[PDB]
Amino acid sequence: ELINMRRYRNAARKLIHHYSLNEYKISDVVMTMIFLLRS
Amino acid sequence: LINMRRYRNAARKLIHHYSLNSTSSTEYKISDVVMTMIFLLRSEKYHSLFKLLETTFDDYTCRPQMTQVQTDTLLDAVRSLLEMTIDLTTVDIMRSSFARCFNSPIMRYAKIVLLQNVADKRTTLEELLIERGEKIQMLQPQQYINSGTEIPFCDDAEFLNRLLKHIDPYPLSRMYYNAANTMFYTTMENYAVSNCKFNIEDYNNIFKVMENI
Amino acid sequence: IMRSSFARCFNSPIMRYAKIVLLQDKRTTLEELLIERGEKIPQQYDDAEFLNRLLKHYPLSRMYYNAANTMFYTTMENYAVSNCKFEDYNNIF
Amino acid sequence: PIKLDLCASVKLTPFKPMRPPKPMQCWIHPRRANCKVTRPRNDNENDMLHMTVLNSVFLNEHAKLYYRHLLRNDQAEARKTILNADSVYECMLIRPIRTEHFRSVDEAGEHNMSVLKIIIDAVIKYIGKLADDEYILIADRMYVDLIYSEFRAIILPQSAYIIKGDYAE
């Protein structure tokens, strides 16, 4: 597996959840966007 | 599908800035790093650098290891993307920049940093100088210019005037910028590799002295 | 990550004991310096046109200045190396 | 608001000799207006300085800001008092190492019990420098303000009062 998909799922979930709400890091955005790209 | 042209441009400019080779200065956004790293994820040849920048997301104290042929493969890949030669210190610069980027969270403004996260036993300038002086004193001066050798001043006035017209369009201010920036880059990287604390303060005291005189 | 945590733990110093660390005005009078030196003190046994040419080949003030400051600075160096206390110089000049 | 025993008892405008900082905020103590962070514009990657605005009431008879009476072997690189009329200003120079930073006691919630151990050691020896017959009072809170890195802890200026007792033997 190129990217462990679990943390990608989790990061995407939490980032989008906080955005919907209205603590994070740029690397987190990187993991979420690559979660996206893989999906 | 995506625009490999823009992705390549972003990746190239970003590495140029991180490697300090380019005296050019430009602000980079999150979009830019996304652009570059997606390019890497698309560049099968550069997927080795892609794994390296993936591993940089880790504790950022690790030093990755790879076999020699893997090493020259990485070097050829980075040379191909840069179309400069290049060396492993540039790779360490890349990795340290990626680590210092990831660990830095999003902010409304750019945080200006100094090169660190390299190597491990903190070193000063004084004993660094001691070692340099000892080794150089132990090394024979391979050259010898004798007498008060005449300066070959090119007295040809028209030669100097053609040189002048040929350099007149040059914005000398840009020349100052590029030269000073490259000087600073080499000085600071030599400090980082030597693991000697770079002292920006006296570096600026140089400019202060210039202003005074 | 946990491996790296252990790595840094290994990279932490531990207790030591106390150590006697190390750390690296009076001007010698002329009399004893001169005594020692002398105690420590034999090996070897008109033209007008040329004069004018020498003359033609220099601000005199600056030249005497350079020579005099040279000699004064060397005398100060000799005093410093000898630890010797330094007016008699003015008596010379 | 100043008067005089003079028959006119003229109004005397309380001119302030110095110029207090305009940006009166502190990321270490954002709520504390009297806390003014000033990372000195210079291990030096984390050099530090901070000025605390207090009332001159906490000054003693010999012109000394009370809490300073129990600081010995002061790890703080620099520290001294200033006054601009009633207001006063304590500026403390510090410089942790690159991998070291100091953090406000406020809302610390620190789980490292040994860091708490060093903090409590600092404060306990501090108050131990007190004299038995001498009583102390604090006018800001029921605690002492302090900032601290894992490596060391540095007391903050305090609303301190020094009242001396007299035990009749």
Binding site: - | N21, P141, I145, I151, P152, F153 | - | -
Partner: protein, 240 residues
């Protein structure tokens, strides 16, 4: 500020008065000064490169530095550059100590940060430490000869008022400027050496502010660098 010159005729009281904003003439003075400085800098560079060409430099400086083997050329070019600099500070002087030596540093173990070029006399004559890899990487640094580098009103004024072959680009101009500046700083260090001793050389290396003490007396009576002022972006916060 303002000057109100009176034009009149003594025959009658008829008088005339013109205010003259000295700012425009001060700006003309400043523009003439900047043009003259640019010209002198460019002609100094022209002389330097012309004497380099007369130094039978075949391959441009860049791969002169890439050349490990031809230390003859490295010594010749460094000696010529330092000669040109000292002549700039000493137009009368055009030759140096009879004997000269040059030593090259080719690794981190031999190359120092900050001052890749150094000197440490062998107690009889001064030897020229020169870090070839450092300058190799210096020139190898990609360059920005397209993005112009910088009061807005006076800037617009100088813009609009400004009524705007051997193979060389502006990149080598950057390269030669950088070499001249590095050798300038190194030569200042070596001036400190020759003028005050090796100990003072060392302390000035450790503290470039001492160049103010030792050269505000002499050099200012200026630098090629002194044309502009230089600093670090947002140096204030950088310091903290």
């Amino acid at each position: 500020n303002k000057v109100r010159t009176v034009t009149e005729i003594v025959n009658s009281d008829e008088k005339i008065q013109k205010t003259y904003e000295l700012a425009e003439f001060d700006l003309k003075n400043l523009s003439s000064l900047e043009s003259y400085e640019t010209l002198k800098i460019k002609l100094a560079l022209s002389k330097y490169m012309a004497m380099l060409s007369t130094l039978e430099m075949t391959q441009p400086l860049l791969e002169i530095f890439r050349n490990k083997a031809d230390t003859r050329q490295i010594a010749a070019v460094v000696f010529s550059t330092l000669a040109f600099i000292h002549n700039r500070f000493h137009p009368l002087v055009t030759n140096f100590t009879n004997k000269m030596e040059f030593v090259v540093t080719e690794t981190n173990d031999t190359s120092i940060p900050g001052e890749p070029i150094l000197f440490t006399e062998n107690e009889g004559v001064l030897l020229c430490s020169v870090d070839r890899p450092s300058i190799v990487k210096m020139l190898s640094r990609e360059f920005d000869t397209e993005a112009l580098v910088n009061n807005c009103n006076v800037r617009i004024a100088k813009t609009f008022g400004a009524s705007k072959d051997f193979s060389i680009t502006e990149v080598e101009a950057t390269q030669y400027l950088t070499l001249l500046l590095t050798v300038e700083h190194a030569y200042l260090h070596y001036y400190i050496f020759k003028n005050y001793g090796v100990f003072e050389y060392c302390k000035s290396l450790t503290d470039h502010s001492l160049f103010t003490n030792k050269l505000r007396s002499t050099m200012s009576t200026n630098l090629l660098l002194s044309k502009f002022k230089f600093t670090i972006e947002d140096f204030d916060k950088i310091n903290s």
